[PDB]
Amino acid sequence: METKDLIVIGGGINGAGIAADAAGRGLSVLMLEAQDLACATSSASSKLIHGGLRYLEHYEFRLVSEALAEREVLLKMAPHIAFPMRFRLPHRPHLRPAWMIRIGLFMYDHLGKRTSLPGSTGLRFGANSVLKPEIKRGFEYSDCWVDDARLVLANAQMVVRKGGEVLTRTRATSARRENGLWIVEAEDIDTGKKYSWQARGLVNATGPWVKQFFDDGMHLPSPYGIRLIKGSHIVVPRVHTQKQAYILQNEDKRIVFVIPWMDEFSIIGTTDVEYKGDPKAVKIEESEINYLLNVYNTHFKKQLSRDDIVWTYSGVRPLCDDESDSPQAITRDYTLDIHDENGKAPLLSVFGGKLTTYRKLAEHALEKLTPYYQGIGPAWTKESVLPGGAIEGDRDDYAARLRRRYPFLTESLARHYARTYGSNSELLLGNAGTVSDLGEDFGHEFYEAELKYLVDHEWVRRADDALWRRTKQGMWLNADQQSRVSQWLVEYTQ
Numbered sequence: 001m002e003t004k005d006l007i008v009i010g011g012g013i014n015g016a017g018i019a020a021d022a023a024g025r026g027l028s029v030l031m032l033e034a035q036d037l038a039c040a041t042s043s044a045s046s047k048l049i050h051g052g053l054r055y056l057e058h059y060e061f062r063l064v065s066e067a068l069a070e071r072e073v074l075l076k077m078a079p080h081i082a083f084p085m086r087f088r089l090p091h092r093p094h095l096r097p098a099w100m101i102r103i104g105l106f107m108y109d110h111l112g113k114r115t116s117l118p119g120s121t122g123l124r125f126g127a128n129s130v131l132k133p134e135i136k137r138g139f140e141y142s143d144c145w146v147d148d149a150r151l152v153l154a155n156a157q158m159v160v161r162k163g164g165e166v167l168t169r170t171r172a173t174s175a176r177r178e179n180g181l182w183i184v185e186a187e188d189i190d191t192g193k194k195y196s197w198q199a200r201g202l203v204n205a206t207g208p209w210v211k212q213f214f215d216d217g218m219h220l221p222s223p224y225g226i227r228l229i230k231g232s233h234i235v236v237p238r239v240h241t242q243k244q245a246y247i248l249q250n251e252d253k254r255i256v257f258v259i260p261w262m263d264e265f266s267i268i269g270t271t272d273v274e275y276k277g278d279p280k281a282v283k284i285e286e287s288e289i290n291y292l293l294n295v296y297n298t299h300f301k302k303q304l305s306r307d308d309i310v311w312t313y314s315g316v317r318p319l320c321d322d323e324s325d326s327p328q329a330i331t332r333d334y335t336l337d338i339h340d341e342n343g344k345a346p347l348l349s350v351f352g353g354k355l356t357t358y359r360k361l362a363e364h365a366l367e368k369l370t371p372y373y374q375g376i377g378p379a380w381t382k383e384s385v386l387p388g389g390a391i392e393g394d395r396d397d398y399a400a401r402l403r404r405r406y407p408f409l410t411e412s413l414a415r416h417y418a419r420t421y422g423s424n425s426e427l428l429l430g431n432a433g434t435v436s437d438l439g440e441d442f443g444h445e446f447y448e449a450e451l452k453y454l455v456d457h458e459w460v461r462r463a464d465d466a467l468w469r470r471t472k473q474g475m476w477l478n479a480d481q482q483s484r485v486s487q488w489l490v491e492y493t494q
């Protein structure tokens, strides 16, 4: 035995959150990820811990209130990678009347309950603003920003910390009930190595693949349909120097964000495009670009063209199919389904579930699995502090504290370590006492010490894991520098 309490198939945010909650109640957990942690939807998001202002218009009170209250649980769990942000909503009275704005903002304020985030205000825009002169009024409120892919990584580390196991580049190929137990077969996507495990419980947390895993992996009927709704983002040099996010009301009733990113960039997104096909094939199309540039360019004085775009990304929302005609109207609430056979081998399956609500989702899931597990521990994550999160202060205090402790660190590198690794920064730096102890410089202060640390402690296997998921150094490294990172990973993981 040899036999796991629980196998979690999926290593995006909901599968990592489930596995981590389960490990911390004393279940023996294995989490399986076909490629890299957060390689799909969980690295393609707008990167916001948000209440979901636009969902109020659709009466989504359970979601908005749960999500609103979770902002502050998450900012305490992961202050290394999550922080407060202010959003500016410009007034477009022809679309929504001030009196209506002014009411939703009240609900946003008191629907979840907020120990700490500031409340909403009105705004005037003058001749000197970043917005076109004919926009003269707006509103400002709070929500949060989170490094989505690194929130997934922090949960995976939590799994291992609590004695669970995490395998990546390992695709589950089937799961079947036999003699009271699950048999889970999986294969290593590079070497072909086959694996078979037994488990007492199974989680299908494969996001856009949830129904396909029922169809091809289990030959079981899926309790729910999935709607795959593509959304894309574009990235430009920062459109202004302000620290605030803008939330823009487009003529179709959608909202589009303009978010400060890494002090140097702005992210513009997103879109709601019905999608069919392979979720791994998803990429931005011409009309998404035209659509995003349109709502930006009709609101701001400094005009962007297509040639300004430095990077794009795209992903598919796996939304529980509530059958709505309009992709923007489909609920963003999640549904969990649990099913046993003869009171044994439960199947927990996950439909939908935004990054904002993963922790609650995960706790709901364990609740449903509880009858099947012995002297299973109680709930515990609201009070936990994720790996990296133990920083005693904010990100910026911590970076100043790192540079005091390790004075060979430039202020930019200290900032990067504090904002990425948080309290794991001391494990990365090890016995380093100079710049030169960090090893090969791969560019933009991405040193061998970081990269080795990423392989040893963050499941990095290929350049993109390191450069696009654990970090966003891919934004600065040239093609030759990125290929040297791959060459190094081959040599080191040989």
Ligand SMILES: Cc1cc2nc3c(=O)[nH]c(=O)nc-3n(C[C@H](O)[C@H](O)[C@H](O)COP(=O)(O)OP(=O)(O)OC[C@H]3O[C@@H](n4cnc5c(N)ncnc54)[C@H](O)[C@@H]3O)c2cc1C
Pocket: 009, 010, 011, 012, 013, 014, 015, 032, 033, 034, 035, 036, 037, 038, 039, 040, 041, 042, 043, 044, 045, 046, 047, 048, 049, 050, 170, 171, 172, 173, 205, 206, 207, 208, 209, 213, 217, 229, 230, 231, 232, 270, 271, 315, 316, 317, 318, 352, 353, 354, 355, 356, 357
């Ligand atoms: C455009 C966009 C913007 C968004 N913005 C926000 C936002 O601002 N705030 C917010 O809270 N949410 C946001 N979301 C929603 C959020 O990103 C998703 O709800 C969330 O990431 C879903 O994660 P998941 O774990 O359920 O799916 P994923 O974990 O991402 O997908 C399944 C994962 O499991 C693995 N897997 C799949 N099948 C198998 C298998 N057969 N065997 C082994 N492994 C497998 C994969 O490889 C895959 O990565 C956004 C979503 C989109 C699309």
Ligand SMILES: CCCCCCCCO[C@@H]1O[C@H](CO)[C@@H](O)[C@H](O)[C@H]1O
Pocket: 091, 093, 094, 096, 097, 098, 099, 136, 137
């Ligand atoms: C227009 C004279 C009052 C000055 C306030 C600035 C304009 C923003 O005022 C807005 O005007 C709209 C009508 O055009 C209404 O639909 C909105 O609810 C109102 O708040």
Ligand SMILES: CCCCCCCCO[C@@H]1O[C@H](CO)[C@@H](O)[C@H](O)[C@H]1O
Pocket: 097, 098, 099, 100, 102, 103, 106
């Ligand atoms: C305190 C916030 C809650 C207010 C309840 C809704 C009434 C808001 O009313 C709005 O205020 C604006 C400012 O003078 C006007 O331009 C708009 O005509 C009016 O609709």
Ligand SMILES: CCCCCCCCO[C@@H]1O[C@H](CO)[C@@H](O)[C@H](O)[C@H]1O
Pocket: 099
């Ligand atoms: C479909 C949207 C209409 C909702 C029905 C409510 C009637 C809206 O009426 C509005 O009420 C406001 C106070 O709440 C006033 O400030 C506005 O000037 C008034 O037009």
Ligand SMILES: CCCCCCCCO[C@@H]1O[C@H](CO)[C@@H](O)[C@H](O)[C@H]1O
Pocket: 053, 054, 055, 056, 057, 058, 100, 101, 102, 103, 104, 105, 106
């Ligand atoms: C009495 C029941 C009425 C519930 C309807 C809630 C109306 C929420 O309206 C919301 O206002 C926000 C501004 O704060 C906008 O950003 C959103 O687009 C809009 O949906």
Ligand SMILES: O=S(=O)(O)CCCNC(CO)(CO)CO
Pocket: 156, 157, 158, 160, 161, 387, 454, 455, 456, 457, 458, 459, 460
């Ligand atoms: O440092 S943690 O314990 O939180 C995670 C360690 C993970 N190590 C691996 C080493 O090959 C992946 O980085 C796999 O066990």
